[PDB]
Amino acid sequence: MNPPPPETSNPNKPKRQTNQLQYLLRVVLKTLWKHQFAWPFQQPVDAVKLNLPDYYKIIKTPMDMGTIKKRLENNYYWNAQECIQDFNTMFTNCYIYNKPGDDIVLMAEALEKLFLQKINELPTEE
Ligand SMILES: CC(=O)N1CCc2c(sc3nc(SCC(=O)Nc4cccnc4C)n(Cc4ccco4)c(=O)c23)C1
């Protein structure tokens, strides 16, 4: 079975709108989301449909861009670092679970390179 996905809203978790979080949705997430390599990362890993019975025995902090997108759209994050951490968790999980040099890793590596380039250009808080 798959676990429940990571939450994307929480009525008790404070929220605000900041220009850095606006940038993470409009520039960073959008650039990665539309990239030709985005698709394996656009939703939680479906260990059932993908026949990966050991995925959630190895990965206990799953994360994916579908979750990140919803968190941004739902004002789930208070700050940019929370979102950056989620992207990093996504990439790290990929590099832990998959064999080095596999295509999925090369795909993540290409997305991470773009990610780091866009994060280097994070605007200062207004
Ligand atoms: C984010 C992330 O880490 N994941 C989500 C996406 C993903 C995996 S693992 C995986 N395998 C395939 S291939 C079928 C397979 O080999 N399953 C399998 C069975 C028994 C043992 N190990 C394996 C791998 N495909 C389809 C595909 C896309 C390009 C190449 O292949 C995938 O999208 C994924 C994990």
UniProtKB/Swiss-Prot annotation:
Task: Note the effect listed for residue 103 to G.
Answer: Found in a patient with a neurodevelopmental syndrome; uncertain significance
Q: Which residues are annotated as site, described as Acetylated histone binding? A: 98
Tissue expression: Ubiquitously expressed.
How is the protein altered post-translationally, as described in the entry?
Phosphorylation by CK2 disrupt the intramolecular binding between the bromo domain 2 and the NPS region and promotes binding between the NPS and the BID regions, leading to activate the protein and promote binding to acetylated histones. In absence of phosphorylation, BRD4 does not localize to p53/TP53 target gene promoters, phosphorylation promoting recruitment to p53/TP53 target promoters.
| The Bromo domain, residue ranges | 16-122
Q: Where is this cross-link: Glycyl lysine isopeptide (Lys-Gly) (interchain with G-Cter in SUMO2)?
A: 57
Superkingdom of this entry's organism? Eukaryota
Q: Where in the cell is it found?
A: Nucleus; Chromosome
Its job = Chromatin reader protein that recognizes and binds acetylated histones and plays a key role in transmission of epigenetic memory across cell divisions and transcription regulation. Remains associated with acetylated chromatin throughout the entire cell cycle and provides epigenetic memory for postmitotic G1 gene transcription by preserving acetylated chromatin status and maintaining high-order chromatin structure. During interphase, plays a key role in regulating the transcription of signal-inducible genes by associating with the P-TEFb complex and recruiting it to promoters.
Q: What else is known?
A: JQ1, a thieno-triazolo-1,4-diazepine derivative, and I-BET, a benzodiazepine derivative, have been tested on tumors with success. Treatment with GSK1210151A (I-BET151, a I-BET derivative) has strong effets on mixed lineage leukemia and promotes myeloid differentiation and leukemia stem-cell depletion.
Family indicated by similarity: Belongs to the BET family.
Q: What is its quaternary makeup?
A: Interacts with p53/TP53; the interaction is direct. Interacts (via CTD region) with CDK9 and CCNT1, acting as an associated component of P-TEFb complex. Interacts with RELA (when acetylated at 'Lys-310'). Interacts (via NET domain) with NSD3, CHD4, BICRA and ATAD5. The interaction with BICRA bridges BRD4 to the GBAF complex. Interacts (via NET domain) with JMJD6 (via JmjC and N-terminal domains); the interaction is stronger in presence of ssRNA and recruits JMJD6 on distal enhancers. Interacts with NSD3. Interacts with NIPBL. (Microbial infection) Interacts with bovine papillomavirus type 1 regulatory protein E2. This interactions may serve for the tethering of viral genomes to host mitotic chromosomes allowing successful partitioning of the viral genome during cell division.
| Disease implication from the record | Cornelia de Lange syndrome 6: A form of Cornelia de Lange syndrome, a clinically heterogeneous developmental disorder associated with malformations affecting multiple systems. It is characterized by facial dysmorphisms, abnormal hands and feet, growth delay, cognitive retardation, hirsutism, gastroesophageal dysfunction and cardiac, ophthalmologic and genitourinary anomalies. CDLS6 inheritance is autosomal dominant.
Domain remarks: The NET domain mediates interaction with a number of chromatin proteins involved in transcription regulation (NSD3, JMJD6, CHD4, GLTSCR1 and ATAD5).
* Record protein name field: Bromodomain-containing protein 4
Organism, scientific name = Homo sapiens (Human)
Tell me the lineage of the source organism: Eukaryota, Metazoa, Chordata, Craniata, Vertebrata
Q: Which residues of the full protein are shown?
A: 44 to 168 of 1362
